[PDB]
Amino acid sequence: GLTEEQRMMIRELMDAQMKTFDTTFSHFKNFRLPGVPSREEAAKWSQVRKDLCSLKVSLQLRGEDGSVWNYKPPADSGGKEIFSLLPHMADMSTYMFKGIISFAKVISYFRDLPIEDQISLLKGAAFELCQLRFNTVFNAETGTWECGRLSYCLEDTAGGFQQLLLEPMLKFHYMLKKLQLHEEEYVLMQAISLFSPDRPGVLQHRVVDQLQEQFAITLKSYIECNRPQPAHRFLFLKIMAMLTELRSINAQHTQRLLRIQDIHPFATPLMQELFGITGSSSLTERHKILHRLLQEGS
Fold first, then answer.
1. How far apart are CA 138 and CA 239, in angstroms?
2. What's the structural domain count of the chain?
């Protein structure tokens, strides 16, 4: 019950996902691992402690030989120890962002936009698309992101599962996993996020709006044709509600990252561009790494 155009749209998105999503993290290598006072600054540190304590994970590294390295992070003793996983997380984030840039570059509708709009849309959506990809490796039974030979396992807090669900990012992963979406539904969610006309700096608002509407109509039609109706009557609206929530989490995450960066620099050069951090006029000149990655052959 899909139009030829709708089937071709899904084929292009699935091709882009297959080419650019390293689902086994086979090519994620050479990453860093954790090693083996004024009143205004005290206020900054206090907020950063809350920001960092929200997402507590242990790290497991499984060797090809069957050996296992497990890292349990330090307790907060009011020092630099709260930052021990930031270099690793910066390397993983950067790796995922490169895959999302490659994903967007494969899509004809994206390449056909002006380069400055390509930059604006990727700045707007990079975190969102990273979290949608991470949801596909999330084990809701074990609270673990299974990243090939790397695992990130949520640390238990005093309030158990009910305390974790208060953290919007964790609630998002649990709620999205429970929808049991198809590969096709995840890639259409990625397309709807990517082609958001209301991102800061977008010029071709009308063209992006029309592309977003066609991706949304394709998803709505996919659900009507491939899922037994009416058990899945409101699945499309649940997905759009999850995208609205992810946009809110995106805004909150950017603010957290900027607070941490301010007292403890950790962002990679690509992260500095995507999140608007200076190091040392036009969108292109302020995003030379993104510009280079978008101009390089997909």
1. 17
2. 1
Is-contact 260 266, C-beta < 8 A?
yes
Burial classification of residue 192, based on how many CB atoms lie within 10 Å of its CB (0-12 exposed, 13-18 middle, 19 or more buried): buried
Q: Is 247 annotated as a binding residue?
A: no
Q: Which amino acid is residue 7, in one-letter code?
A: R
Binding residue per annotation — 132? yes
Is 47 annotated to bind a ligand? Reply is no
Q: 231 is written with which tokens?
A: 């058990």
Q: What is each CA distance from 298 to 104, 106, 186, 222, 270, in whole angstroms? A: 10, 6, 21, 28, 18
Give the residue numbers spanning the domain of 109.
1-298
Is residue 212 annotated as involved in ligand binding?
Answer: no
Reported structure resolution in angstroms: 1.9
Exposure string over 141-169, b if 16+ CB within 10 A, otherwise e: eebbbbbeebbbbbeeeeeeeeebeebeb
Q: Can you name the residues that pair with 70 across neighbouring β-strands?
A: 60
* Kind and range of the H or E run holding 44: helix 39-53
Q: Which of 270, 13, 281 is nearest to 123 (CA)?
A: 270
Strand pairing category for 150-154 and 57-62: antiparallel
Distance CA 46, CA 57 (A): 20
253 marked as part of a ligand binding site? yes
For the chain, what's the residue count?
Answer: 298
